[PDB]
Amino acid sequence: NESQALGDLAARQLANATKTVPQLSTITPRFLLHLLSWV
């Protein structure tokens, strides 16, 4: 169809995406390391 204005696909070429640090699914709270005392 005949668009009346600039589209999103063409306009997004000028914009920066927000990138996160990689997410690790094997991370656990590791309560044992906090419950113990270290000498």
Partner: protein, 53 residues
């Protein structure tokens, strides 16, 4: 300078489809053209290459 090794060159596509109205004489009350500027959806991207030893 390139901050992260990738350089993107954005370009206008179909520059002849931008419509403009110019009057030669005795202006009228006719509707004006409506237009926009279009961009290329797959611009060329440059990545730096290494020369090393």
């Amino acid at each position: 300078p390139v901050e992260a090794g990738i350089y993107r060159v954005n370009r206008v596509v179909n520059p002849d489809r931008v419509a403009i109205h110019s009057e030669a004489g005795a202006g009228t009350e006719e509707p004006l053209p409506e237009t926009y500027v279009d961009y290329e959806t797959h611009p060329r991207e440059y990545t730096l290459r290494s020369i090393s030893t």
